[PDB]
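Severity: low
Component: inverse-folding endpoint
Summary: output formatting inconsistent between runs
Steps to reproduce: submit the following structure tokens with default settings.
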């Protein structure tokens, strides 16, 4: 009969009950200001189809972040703009400040609030158990907010989380893969970055939801508390599911596929094998034991589940005992 349908356990109908102006990004009117108010300072990084710069707004002498987009697909640029406008001012969401075009090259560019990203590789051995709980809670505030606004981020990973450690300030960035959640909709599974892809994407289950972001968040938590980056080290999209199965086991994978009547791709035939369900305590070592606790492992166990419906929502996660020590 094909795959079994699924819907989000929370914020299911938030877009259904809003006028088209909110979620119909193709009809949104963009007003492209003048790029001359900004002067580019330095390159911060380069993505698939974008280049990010530190810049200065010459009218007020304030630093900003400018993301120059390679306009390969206009519909995708309109989607990112509409989502950023909808989420503007949400907790720990990057703030869109302007939208401009090069008067001469006419290449689109998004102008954001400035974020002072602390370099981390240096201070990952510096983070304490408390710091991980604190920043995980700040990410959860951003996710509960965007999910409540009917948006899935679909690219949660450390590169998309900027932290200014000195000011204990976090921003969830790069909403280029974000999408509006509409119950029953079949989405493209070619989203997120390999190590953070949820099992739903790897088995080509298209009717996914906000819970995809909770899987990605679980991958980040596991890599931080265990000092293992990435946690699930796949070499391709099929091998990525095998890396997950080497931890969660193959029995629960078949229960997940059976529950949703998913047809497993033949490419899994010779590589999946048989794997027992591992105890999370097996990843604890002398290098990471100061970051691990029974609460952390119980919280991680509740995010890293094959069944997208069984994972904690962002609001349920914020109520977990792991966060009893953080201000809420
Ligand atoms: N394009 C995807 C899409 C856009 C809008 C809707 C919708 C929203 C509200 C009421 C009826 C339909 C749906 Cl289901 C999907
Ligand atoms: N100096 C002024 C200036 C000129 C052009 C741009 C620009 C805008 C969009 C795409 C590429 C470049 C910017 Cl940010 C500033
Ligand atoms: C393209 O240039 C840009 O503007 C992007 C850009 O500058 N990105 C730099 C990525 C910064 N990442 C740092 C970081 C550190 C710790 C965590 C963390 C993970 C789990 C639990 C607690 C904290 C995360 Cl999510 C991120």
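Observed output (run 2 of 3):
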């Amino acid at each position: 009969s094909g795959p079994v349908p699924s819907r989000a356990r929370v914020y299911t109908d938030v877009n259904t009950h809003r006028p088209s102006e909110y979620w119909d990004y193709e009809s949104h009117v963009v007003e492209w200001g003048n790029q001359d108010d900004y002067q580019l300072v330095r390159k911060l990084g380069r993505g698939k189809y974008s280049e990010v710069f530190e810049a200065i707004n010459i009218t007020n002498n304030e630093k900003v972040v400018v993301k120059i987009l390679k306009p390969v697909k206009k519909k995708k640029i309109k989607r990112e703009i509409k989502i950023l406008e909808n989420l503007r001012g949400g907790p720990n969401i990057i703030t869109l400040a302007d939208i401009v075009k090069d008067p001469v090259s006419r290449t689109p560019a998004l102008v954001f609030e400035h974020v002072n990203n602390t370099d981390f590789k240096q201070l990952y051995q510096t983070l304490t158990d408390y710091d991980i709980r604190f920043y995980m809670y700040e990410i959860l505030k951003a996710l509960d907010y965007c999910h409540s606004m009917g948006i899935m981020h679909r690219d949660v990973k450390p590169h998309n989380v900027m932290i200014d450690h000195e000011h204990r300030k976090l921003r969830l960035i790069d909403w280029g893969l974000a999408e509006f959640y509409h119950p029953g909709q079949e989405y493209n599974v070619r989203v997120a970055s390999r190590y953070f892809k949820g099992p739903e994407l790897l088995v080509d289950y298209q009717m996914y939801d906000y819970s995809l972001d909770m899987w990605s968040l679980g991958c980040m938590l596991a890599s931080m508390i265990f000092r293992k980056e990435p946690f699930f080290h796949g070499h391709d999209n099929y091998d990525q599911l095998v890396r997950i199965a080497k931890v969660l086991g193959t029995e629960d994978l078949y229960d997940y596929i059976d529950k949703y009547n998913i047809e497993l791709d033949p490419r899994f035939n010779d590589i999946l094998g048989r794997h027992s369900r591992k105890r999370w305590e097996r990843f604890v070592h002398s290098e990471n034991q100061h970051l691990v606790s029974p609460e952390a492992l119980d919280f991680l166990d509740k995010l890293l589940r094959y069944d997208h419906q069984s994972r904690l929502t962002a609001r349920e996660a914020m109520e977990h005992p792991y966060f009893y020590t953080v201000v809420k």
